[PDB]
Symmetry: C4
Subunit: 277 residues, 4 copies
Amino acid sequence: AMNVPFWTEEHVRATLPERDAESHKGTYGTALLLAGSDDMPGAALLAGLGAMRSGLGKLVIGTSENVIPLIVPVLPEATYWRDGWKKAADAQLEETYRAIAIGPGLPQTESVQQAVDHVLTADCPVILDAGALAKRTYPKREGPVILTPHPGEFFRMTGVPVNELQKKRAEYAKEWAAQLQTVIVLKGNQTVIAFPDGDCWLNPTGNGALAKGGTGDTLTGMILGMLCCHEDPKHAVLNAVYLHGACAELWTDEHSAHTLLAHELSDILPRVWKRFE
Amino acid sequence: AMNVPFWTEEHVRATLPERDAESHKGTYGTALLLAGSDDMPGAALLAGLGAMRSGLGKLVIGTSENVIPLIVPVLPEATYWRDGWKKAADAQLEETYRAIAIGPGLPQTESVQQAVDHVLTADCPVILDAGALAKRTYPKREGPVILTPHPGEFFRMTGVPVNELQKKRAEYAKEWAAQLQTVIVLKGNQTVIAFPDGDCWLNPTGNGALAKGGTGDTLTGMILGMLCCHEDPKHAVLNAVYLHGACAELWTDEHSAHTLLAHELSDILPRVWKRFE
Amino acid sequence: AMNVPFWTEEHVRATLPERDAESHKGTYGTALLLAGSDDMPGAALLAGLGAMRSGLGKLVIGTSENVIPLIVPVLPEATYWRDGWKKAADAQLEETYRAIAIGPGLPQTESVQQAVDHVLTADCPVILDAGALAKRTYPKREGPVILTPHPGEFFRMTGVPVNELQKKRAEYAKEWAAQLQTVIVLKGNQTVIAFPDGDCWLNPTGNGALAKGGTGDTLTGMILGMLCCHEDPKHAVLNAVYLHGACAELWTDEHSAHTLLAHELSDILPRVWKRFE
Amino acid sequence: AMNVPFWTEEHVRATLPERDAESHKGTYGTALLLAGSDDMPGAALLAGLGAMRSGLGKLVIGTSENVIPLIVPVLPEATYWRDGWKKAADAQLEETYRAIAIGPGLPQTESVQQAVDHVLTADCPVILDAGALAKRTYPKREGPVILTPHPGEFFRMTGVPVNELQKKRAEYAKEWAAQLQTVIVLKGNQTVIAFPDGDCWLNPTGNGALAKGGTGDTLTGMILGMLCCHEDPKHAVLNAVYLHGACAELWTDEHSAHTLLAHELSDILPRVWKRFE
Ligand SMILES: NC(=O)C1=CN([C@@H]2O[C@H](COP(=O)(O)OP(=O)(O)OC[C@H]3O[C@@H](n4cnc5c(N)ncnc54)[C@H](OP(=O)(O)O)[C@@H]3O)[C@@H](O)[C@H]2O)[C@@H](O)CC1
Ligand SMILES: NC(=O)C1=CN([C@@H]2O[C@H](COP(=O)(O)OP(=O)(O)OC[C@H]3O[C@@H](n4cnc5c(N)ncnc54)[C@H](OP(=O)(O)O)[C@@H]3O)[C@@H](O)[C@H]2O)[C@@H](O)CC1
Ligand SMILES: NC(=O)C1=CN([C@@H]2O[C@H](COP(=O)(O)OP(=O)(O)OC[C@H]3O[C@@H](n4cnc5c(N)ncnc54)[C@H](OP(=O)(O)O)[C@@H]3O)[C@@H](O)[C@H]2O)[C@@H](O)CC1
Ligand SMILES: NC(=O)C1=CN([C@@H]2O[C@H](COP(=O)(O)OP(=O)(O)OC[C@H]3O[C@@H](n4cnc5c(N)ncnc54)[C@H](OP(=O)(O)O)[C@@H]3O)[C@@H](O)[C@H]2O)[C@@H](O)CC1
Ligand SMILES: Nc1ncnc2c1ncn2[C@@H]1O[C@H](COP(=O)(O)O)[C@@H](O)[C@H]1O
Ligand SMILES: Nc1ncnc2c1ncn2[C@@H]1O[C@H](COP(=O)(O)O)[C@@H](O)[C@H]1O
Ligand SMILES: Nc1ncnc2c1ncn2[C@@H]1O[C@H](COP(=O)(O)O)[C@@H](O)[C@H]1O
Ligand SMILES: Nc1ncnc2c1ncn2[C@@H]1O[C@H](COP(=O)(O)O)[C@@H](O)[C@H]1O
Ligand SMILES: [Mg+2]
Ligand SMILES: [Mg+2]
Ligand SMILES: [Mg+2]
Ligand SMILES: [Mg+2]
């Protein structure tokens, strides 16, 4: 009804970054991922793989001691801030990060909110997902805050019931991005990407292969990595959401949509991203 | 002798579900898998991979603390109910599940039977396999109970000796499905799928590549996932057994039947299932 | 000089077993693998993968508690006898196995020899490798004993110096197979397979891709599995040694011989074995 | 400005070693890798995979107890010296190694320098990387010492600021290789390989796919393995640096340069190395 435009293949091709010959890992920054807990460890691996696949320089994973060993053999390229998401509840970060994500596989607790409050004093884009999403307001800061709710999480954030939300997705997402002054990636078929300056887009990619545990955890990681290699954080968010869906569409060419596992999205991204270069 | 019909490719094609564009993981439900023990941990990974490959929305694995870390790196998409199969012995489940499986890699003990008794008070289909199979009766409930014995397990359940059973497989399977009022998937070459309402089918797929440890553990998982995406639980059971065998037949096109490992069935299923769409 | 014949492709094709449609895992037996220690854990994974790829029904791995978790995610199809190689030092095995292997990654100790002495009271073929190879004699028993030394291990077994051995490999291997009344698989380019009844063969397959840690550990496993699916244990040994080498020759078609990792031999075997069917 | 020649495909083809039919693992030696720590475990897996892929006979990894289990499932072919990098601080090595590398994922501490001092009393090539790089001098010894700094590490070693270094890379690398009497592999686009006898080369391979955490850890391992199979250690260093870059160039043919993970370099090397045979 609002005629929200799609972020199309043409926009993706025009905005994906180069990886220059005269670059090193520092050029692409160090990201921090605060994710994973004892009974939801896998979300950290999923988001970590999404992040490292998505063009960052380095990744530090701040997770519980028991989660670390479960990541290493699959994603040996990441390093660790031991019990980092718990530690983040106690103090401002002393390390400089290019971008930070918090929430996948974290319990939805006040301690996690304390960690969010500390991370927001950093000068970098911050993504809040999953257990880091709550009903709250956000401090004025320079770097964007990017919230990635599915409709259930949006209800938790706003009190807008899911059945009402789903009738007017872009309208609600835009209204709340404006009110909160955050980016809102309202997930679902035709994901809405609403910016607090009023810009808004729909994502045209993806299918029901994505309707399975873990896929949003992977997405959070993809956004985190893309924030590190794109000059414009808006493009990073839009390209992450687009390519995430494009990976599922590649899968379904020769595989049943019932059968995708989220980590395979990260495995598919290398070839999919090349197509748009 | 009874002229039991085969569940054929035509029946599979006619009954496999769509994965709608306007779905999310909740559409396809959360399954519970109660499996894996200290000296048989791998059965939990095998059944978990089968389940998550088979069209569910989410999977919770209730297994021993020592088993959890062995699953995560391979199947990061699952979450955990820590010591869940032991905990299930103590109380009705407070969580709602779309379908539940219990038994792979569980010791054949009275505590496991206590867990079975608690899970059966849930209102969902329940699969009993392996260490959860015993000589017993089943309470009247709305959701189907699906037993998945091989002939040795059927002897344990019924007292019918294996050598006698194997001469009259469909007759025994039908008789006992009726007596117990459970589904019985009596495994073997030409697996019998006997329903307590008298319907019965033979499975036409599979080969001796399946004659190796773990393959029945994978099957239990495949049934669990298919119960979550099929409207008719009968079709879910029949399609799981069929596709499980079809995966082994794909394998043997270019690989020796002596050399299959059960987890590869789950890896093959994506492409095999696409063929029937 | 003795004109020892090669075990050729024709002999392999004539002797590889069928996997019948009317078989189950029990048809192909349960093997026991006694392997792996705290600072050499990987040998257990290598031999376990070789075994399960090679046509057995089930595999029990008797290894240290700390080794178990390192196997499971890669070879979830195996089950465990916790601290089994240590436990085997204390008593005859109460379980019936189709075939047993002992030694890969085990320290070369008197306790391991105690375990060997207990395993030899079983009525099945037994393979001794690596840390289970010592200077000793063997009791009269029905099942074959198969020793798998490289030339260094043969020196340890016999006192024949390596430089002397390597000039007259088949002569020494035959002499000592006769004296000990064991099979001896004397490894190296042109591996010698010497039977205690005087039969002897050379293996024509393999290349320097195999000249790297772990490949003999994989071989022990391959022999173990092949003993479970071949009616004639002689053929099992000969086909294992042949196919092990054939896997390296496949690898080198498109990969450098400097770059093979032993576990990949197990990954290649499915396609290689199909070629000989 | 100095007209430093490139180490070209022709030089690689002329100097890569054969893997003879009449070789065994001992022919290619046992390497020691001292790498990996609790919050940087993955560097040990990365360097270990690079090493074992690169033509050694055996690899011993001296790492922390907590790191060992994270390597085994992915690189089962390696064995361990438990807490070896810490133990190396206390005494000369009693074991003979073909080549030794120290530093990836090790904290940059005086204890690591103590380990370096002990390893240098061995008679073999030694590679120092990462946490083993410090401002120091080196004792006269027969085997080469190979330092592998990126420009930040070179600043730490020398006091030459990065912005100055990067204007005159070959000049500085040559000057300091001469002063220290070590090989210096000064990383970056157009890596400089400077020998203490005055020979110097530029590497023509690689791209921004390498500008991500872990890739230098992999390289250290590749050098370690190549030192074991090349007769001339100069060629080993030059071929490792060249092939490492060539692997990234293969990747980018069909994958985006933003998306490479370092361990995949090791996975690509088998096919890339074959191209130069
Ligand atoms: N492997 C791991 O470690 C995994 C970890 N994970 C972690 O689990 C944590 C909890 O996150 P979660 O999303 O699983 O559960 P939760 O917040 O209760 O939301 C469900 C509610 O939202 C609703 N709803 C959602 N989408 C909707 C739509 N399109 N349209 C309509 N309704 C929609 C849904 O509605 P329903 O289907 O019930 O109608 C239900 O009410 C979090 O930390 C996450 O990172 C998971 O990613 C799993 C894999
Ligand atoms: N990796 C893991 O964690 C693994 C875990 N697993 C777990 O192990 C547990 C025990 O289950 P299991 O099936 O291994 O042994 P068990 O119940 O003793 O049955 C064998 C008996 O049945 C018979 N029999 C079977 N089929 C037959 C047929 N077609 N036709 C005829 N006879 C037939 C067979 O006969 P036989 O060959 O002796 O004549 C023998 O008497 C269970 O929890 C399972 O999940 C396993 O899946 C292994 C991988
Ligand atoms: N990942 C793991 O867990 C791994 C574990 N492993 C475990 O390590 C344990 C020790 O076994 P191992 O074979 O590594 O050492 P060891 O018995 O000292 O033998 C070397 C001696 O033999 C000689 N020699 C050998 N072949 C020869 C030939 N063709 N021709 C001539 N000489 C020959 C060689 O001679 P050299 O080269 O010194 O002249 C040297 O003297 C064992 O339990 C094994 O399973 C390994 O498999 C590694 C991967
Ligand atoms: N998965 C794991 O276990 C991993 C483990 N690892 C381990 O981490 C440890 C620390 O090593 P590290 O290289 O990450 O950090 P560090 O020494 O602080 O160097 C950065 C400094 O150097 C500079 N700089 C570098 N290149 C440059 C260039 N071309 N041109 C210009 N400047 C350049 C850079 O400059 P900047 O970008 O800031 O301008 C910054 O100042 C080590 O043990 C390693 O093995 C890592 O490999 C990660 C994966
Ligand atoms: N049917 C669908 N079509 C397109 N995208 C979907 C579909 N189902 C799920 N997704 C995407 O999958 C992810 C689910 O996130 P979450 O529930 O946090 O795991 C989001 O990126 C969704 O937009
Ligand atoms: N020879 C065979 N032909 C067809 N299916 C088989 C064969 N051997 C085993 N299977 C199947 O493999 C599984 C074995 O289950 P289980 O013994 O519980 O692991 C069941 O699905 C069997 O029907
Ligand atoms: N150059 C080679 N040619 C053929 N086979 C080889 C070669 N080097 C090693 N092997 C085989 O690799 C294995 C090495 O065993 P081991 O030393 O116990 O790991 C044996 O099967 C050897 O016969
Ligand atoms: N843009 C680039 N072009 C070529 N090689 C690169 C590039 N960025 C990084 N590398 C290589 O990647 C490795 C980085 O090492 P390090 O920082 O120790 O992980 C070295 O081998 C670098 O020369
Ligand atoms: Mg989510
Ligand atoms: Mg079973
Ligand atoms: Mg050996
Ligand atoms: Mg480095």
